[PDB]
Amino acid sequence: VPPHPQDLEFTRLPNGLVIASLENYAPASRIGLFIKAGSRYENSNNLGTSHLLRLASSLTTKGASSFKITRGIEAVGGKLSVTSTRENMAYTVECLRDDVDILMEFLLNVTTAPEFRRWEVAALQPQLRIDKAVALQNPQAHVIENLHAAAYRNALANSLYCPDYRIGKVTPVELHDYVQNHFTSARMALIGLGVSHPVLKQVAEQFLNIRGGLGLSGAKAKYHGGEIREQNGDSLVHAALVAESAAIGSAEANAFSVLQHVLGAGPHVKRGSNATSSLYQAVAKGVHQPFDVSAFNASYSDSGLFGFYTISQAASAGDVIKAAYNQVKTIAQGNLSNPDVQAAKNKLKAGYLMSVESSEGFLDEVGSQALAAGSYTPPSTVLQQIDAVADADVINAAKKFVSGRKSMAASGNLGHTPFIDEL
Amino acid sequence: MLTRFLGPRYRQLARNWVPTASLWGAVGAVGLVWATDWRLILDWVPYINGKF
Amino acid sequence: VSASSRWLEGIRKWYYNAAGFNKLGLMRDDTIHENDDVKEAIRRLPENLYNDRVFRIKRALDLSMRQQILPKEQWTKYEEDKSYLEPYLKEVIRERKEREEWAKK
Amino acid sequence: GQAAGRPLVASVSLNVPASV
Amino acid sequence: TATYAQALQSVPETQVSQLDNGLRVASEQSSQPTCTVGVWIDAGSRYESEKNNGAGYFVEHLAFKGTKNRPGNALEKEVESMGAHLNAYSTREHTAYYIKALSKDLPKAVELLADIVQNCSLEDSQIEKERDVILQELQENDTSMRDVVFNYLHATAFQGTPLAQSVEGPSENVRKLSRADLTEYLSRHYKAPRMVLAAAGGLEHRQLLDLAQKHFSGLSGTYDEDAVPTLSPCRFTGSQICHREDGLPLAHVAIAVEGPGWAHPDNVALQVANAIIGHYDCTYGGGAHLSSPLASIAATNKLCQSFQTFNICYADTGLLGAHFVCDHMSIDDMMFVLQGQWMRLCTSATESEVLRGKNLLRNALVSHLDGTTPVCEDIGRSLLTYGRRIPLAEWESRIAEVDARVVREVCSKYFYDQCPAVAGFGPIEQLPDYNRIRSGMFWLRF
């Protein structure tokens, strides 16, 4: 039988910094520094700076050389990772309990005192080319990046990966300016599993008090609409069609999540027919070739994108897209039963609980809540908010998708893929 | 000058490698006695003694 | 001011003038023997200092070929000869000694 | 299940293969 | 204030019980809202003969397609409606079916598992429809060079024995496997003393036992007359297979020696030694400063795009070795440095690198058993291989015993002057001759 579980603790310091600890009793500890420094905060003059920054965590700092960081971390078998989205950067570290002090010292040095030495930065530049190429052999990454480029005019239009023409041109000064004006106390959150609260509070008060000086309000994302088409003659056509939906944290976002699971988000059974997926059956009626289709949902602080993603043969692309769009229209017209929405709510609640069952996903959820909302909302309240979604909200969300200005991206042999005005 | 070789690892390596160098020294010693027919040592060997 | 320091300054100035590399227009760091540490330190230099070093060495080699020296007004002054290769070589040696110390354990 | 459903995330690590 | 060891003692004990028919029911209770429950069966392609090879893999494709009680896609809808996830896999020695679901849905999930392992009809229309599906998957699988080279390694290492067979079977077998072959396979292998109902999550072991006696008591625990399959030991063979195919842009190479098996204590020390060699990928950030000599040399000199060491265990045998991927003009250097590191660990292992490998193994052990699904897998598989769950405090005890001397003796016992099995695929013209590889397994200086 396990002990009585301790509930998480949370603290906002007057300088804006957020500390969040949970004292469990697992043999390992995990610590993460979440920063509002994603690619949205680049502009047209310093594009790619956050990609190179993401690759430079093992470069020399003011307190530890690169050799010392690599050998000290590897000596005690620990791990250091840097995960980056369009909005956040997450410097996360894992190790056994008795070595957290060692690895904590490395983490602050990586984030608060990098030197960005000219020769070290220069020698790292070709890795940008390798890292992008490895990422870009999944067609979904290409398509989704073009989808964002077509949807937005600025900030959220920026890619997670460096444009090819900039490889070799990112300078140490740009890295200094990016760290200096984005890695500040009011933009940061320190989360920890398997660590005591006094220790984290001591570290924060001792070493993260010299990161003041907020600034760079950036710019709000202006949804535009448009279409990007990539003729490359691949075997299959990938296509994504979306509209503006809703900002995260709003009540409408729960309605969109439920609509996502009514339409069909992903498969649950190995080699299954997707029986309860209304999009898959709708396309399956008049399309006998192989294909796949899935609802797409991406929510951010001040905007969102909802729609669907199709993969099909080049000749069947139009049929699959038009069948999926008609199925969404049919839902927008009110043809939606109550067992459907109740099953969708069950899928959503189960998916949410399963998404925070790992220590990694729990730490990521707590860091995201800490930066977006400034608080911790326990799971039970989230399930409460999910149950409160009414069917009329889902129909209204479908109306919003059907009537909103569309954005489209496609890759493949596009000789039979329709334009937006042909849908 | 050569102070860089003073550490725990280098004395673990020497302790691991002294039996092999000892055996290659026995190989060289026996090979020299055999190749030169050194009577000073071979007079003591039992069956070899009859050759002289 | 210290008398011993004064004698050291005088002796160092005398030895600098006697060495004679200034007559070819070179600096002290131009004449360093190049090994792996010095090769890395030179590899880390910025563009302008590297190009200046290259041109100074080339001019010195041409003067040596022709068995000439510069006029006395172009000789490098002892006081203005400031080392440009100090911090780079210092950092490279520091890193190498850190690697050796780790290897000892 | 190859179709994308959620926005991209880019991962980089000192001693682990990168992922997307 | 708590130490690592005290945290290792706080992990709850895995309760184990056995029914009258022989079905073992095991569970690890947590305070989690979700759970994982499933059935691990002691069946695989090593038990299949040349006639019916690929039968079990065929059955995996039919397990979720319908039953006598829930025909057609009715099962798929029942699983989907409660938000659960149903999954399965087959290896050469183990088959597994498991469900991830809310704790409240535990009674129905267990029922479905009972329905799957007992009441399978295998509709003729479904057998014929899954025939072309499997054949298409074989065509797709041909394009994964990693899977190809590992099937070649098994094919040559254990040639002439059941372990040489692939899991999917040959193309010819799949196009004539009949329904009678599948029913005979099921009635001969899905017996109660070879299955283990494992669970992990928020659940009391009492209710799992009750559901087990409710839906698995009817399972047949009485074998046929004097019928019981026994695994014969498999002769290992030092040999080489080279598929030269220059149309491909990179060479894949897998090399391995004979391991001891699941229950040999030396595996712990072997896992320490492989941790010293570690792994590498061209996307790593460390590069020149990496601790592993092989990794730093490969990074600085660009000798390969990736490599990994492995220790694949079976009953009383196994494959211990490495695999790498590289340009066609770099194979000799990679082979040279790899064998040099094996000999270095055989003859001159130091204390500090061994402490490194111990720490790596401790972190890998703790970080892997993190979640309901890996724990449920460790329960079922441990109950099949070891016959019990080995607590983490015991693994820590076995790891602490390992020192440099133990590593030198175990490595000399399994690597030094042994005949390896080699598998090469792609532009492998520069792959060294077998005699040169074999000569690379000892040192004239030693």
Curated annotation (Swiss-Prot), chain A:
The modification N6-acetyllysine is found at K36, K169, K220. The keyword Cell inner membrane does not apply. GO terms for biological process: proteolysis. Component of the ubiquinol-cytochrome c oxidoreductase (cytochrome b-c1 complex, complex III, CIII), a multisubunit enzyme composed of 11 subunits. The complex is composed of 3 respiratory subunits cytochrome b, cytochrome c1 and Rieske protein UQCRFS1, 2 core protein subunits UQCRC1/QCR1 and UQCRC2/QCR2, and 6 low-molecular weight protein subunits UQCRH/QCR6, UQCRB/QCR7, UQCRQ/QCR8, UQCR10/QCR9, UQCR11/QCR10 and subunit 9, the cleavage product of Rieske protein UQCRFS1. This is Cytochrome b-c1 complex subunit 2, mitochondrial. Belongs to the peptidase M16 family. UQCRC2/QCR2 subfamily. The lineage of its organism: Eukaryota, Metazoa, Chordata, Craniata, Vertebrata. Component of the ubiquinol-cytochrome c oxidoreductase, a multisubunit transmembrane complex that is part of the mitochondrial electron transport chain which drives oxidative phosphorylation. It comes from Bos taurus.
Curated annotation (Swiss-Prot), chain B:
GO terms for cellular component: mitochondrial inner membrane; respiratory chain complex III. The keyword Transmembrane applies. GO terms for biological process: mitochondrial electron transport, ubiquinol to cytochrome c. The keyword Protein biosynthesis does not apply. Component of the ubiquinol-cytochrome c oxidoreductase, a multisubunit transmembrane complex that is part of the mitochondrial electron transport chain which drives oxidative phosphorylation. Component of the ubiquinol-cytochrome c oxidoreductase (cytochrome b-c1 complex, complex III, CIII), a multisubunit enzyme composed of 11 subunits. The complex is composed of 3 respiratory subunits cytochrome b, cytochrome c1 and Rieske protein UQCRFS1, 2 core protein subunits UQCRC1/QCR1 and UQCRC2/QCR2, and 6 low-molecular weight protein subunits UQCRH/QCR6, UQCRB/QCR7, UQCRQ/QCR8, UQCR10/QCR9, UQCR11/QCR10 and subunit 9, the cleavage product of Rieske protein UQCRFS1. Belongs to the UQCR11/QCR10 family. This is Cytochrome b-c1 complex subunit 10. It comes from Bos taurus. The gene is UQCR11.
Curated annotation (Swiss-Prot), chain C:
It is found in: Mitochondrion inner membrane. This is Cytochrome b-c1 complex subunit 7. It is a peripheral membrane protein. The keyword Mitochondrion applies. The modification N6-acetyllysine is found at K13, K72, K77, K82, K90. The modification N6-succinyllysine is found at K72, K82. Component of the ubiquinol-cytochrome c oxidoreductase (cytochrome b-c1 complex, complex III, CIII), a multisubunit enzyme composed of 11 subunits. The complex is composed of 3 respiratory subunits cytochrome b, cytochrome c1 and Rieske protein UQCRFS1, 2 core protein subunits UQCRC1/QCR1 and UQCRC2/QCR2, and 6 low-molecular weight protein subunits UQCRH/QCR6, UQCRB/QCR7, UQCRQ/QCR8, UQCR10/QCR9, UQCR11/QCR10 and subunit 9, the cleavage product of Rieske protein UQCRFS1. It holds the Pfam family UCR_14kD. The keyword Acetylation applies. Belongs to the UQCRB/QCR7 family. GO terms for biological process: mitochondrial electron transport, ubiquinol to cytochrome c. Keywords: Acetylation, Electron transport, Membrane, Mitochondrion, Mitochondrion inner membrane, Respiratory chain, Transport.
Curated annotation (Swiss-Prot), chain E:
It is a peripheral membrane protein. It comes from the Eukaryota. It is found in: Mitochondrion inner membrane. Signal peptide: none annotated. The modification Phosphoserine is found at S178. Keywords: Acetylation, Electron transport, Membrane, Mitochondrion, Mitochondrion inner membrane, Phosphoprotein, Respiratory chain, Transit peptide, Transport. One of its GO terms (molecular function) is metal ion binding. The modification N6-succinyllysine is found at K129. The keyword Mitochondrion applies. The modification N6-acetyllysine is found at K77, K104, K129, K214. GO terms for cellular component: mitochondrial inner membrane; mitochondrion. Component of the ubiquinol-cytochrome c oxidoreductase (cytochrome b-c1 complex, complex III, CIII), a multisubunit enzyme composed of 11 subunits. The complex is composed of 3 respiratory subunits cytochrome b, cytochrome c1 and Rieske protein UQCRFS1, 2 core protein subunits UQCRC1/QCR1 and UQCRC2/QCR2, and 6 low-molecular weight protein subunits UQCRH/QCR6, UQCRB/QCR7, UQCRQ/QCR8, UQCR10/QCR9, UQCR11/QCR10 and subunit 9, the cleavage product of Rieske protein UQCRFS1. Component of the ubiquinol-cytochrome c oxidoreductase, a multisubunit transmembrane complex that is part of the mitochondrial electron transport chain which drives oxidative phosphorylation. Belongs to the peptidase M16 family. UQCRC1/QCR1 subfamily. This is Cytochrome b-c1 complex subunit 1, mitochondrial. It comes from Bos taurus.
